[PDB]
């Protein structure tokens, strides 16, 4: 939630 | 991206 | 209790 | 989600 990614 | 928060 | 997750 | 509280 304000981070990003991607998993 | 898939985990949440709220920071 | 205010703060999210997920666990 | 899945503690307590309160805050
Ligand atoms: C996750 O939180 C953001 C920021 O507030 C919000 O815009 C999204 O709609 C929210 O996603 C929902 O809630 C999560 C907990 C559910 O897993 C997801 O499927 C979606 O309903
Ligand atoms: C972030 O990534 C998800 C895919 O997991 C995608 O659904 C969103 O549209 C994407 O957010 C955009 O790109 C990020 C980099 C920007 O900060 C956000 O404002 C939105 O434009
Ligand atoms: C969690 O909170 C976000 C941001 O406020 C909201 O967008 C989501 O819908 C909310 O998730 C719901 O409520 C929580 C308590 C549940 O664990 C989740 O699965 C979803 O129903
Ligand atoms: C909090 O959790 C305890 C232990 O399970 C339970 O006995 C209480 O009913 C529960 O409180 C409710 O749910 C929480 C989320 C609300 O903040 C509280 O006001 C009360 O409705
Ligand atoms: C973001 C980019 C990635 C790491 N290559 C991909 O595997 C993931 C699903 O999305
Ligand atoms: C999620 C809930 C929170 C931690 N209490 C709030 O400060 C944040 C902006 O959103
Ligand atoms: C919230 C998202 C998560 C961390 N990917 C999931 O494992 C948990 C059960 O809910
Ligand atoms: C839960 C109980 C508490 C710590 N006394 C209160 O201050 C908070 C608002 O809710
Ligand atoms: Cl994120
Ligand atoms: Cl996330
Ligand atoms: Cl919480
Ligand atoms: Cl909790």
Request: no cysteine; hydrophobic share 0%; net charge neutral.
């Amino acid at each position: 939630x304000x981070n990003x990614x991607y998993x």
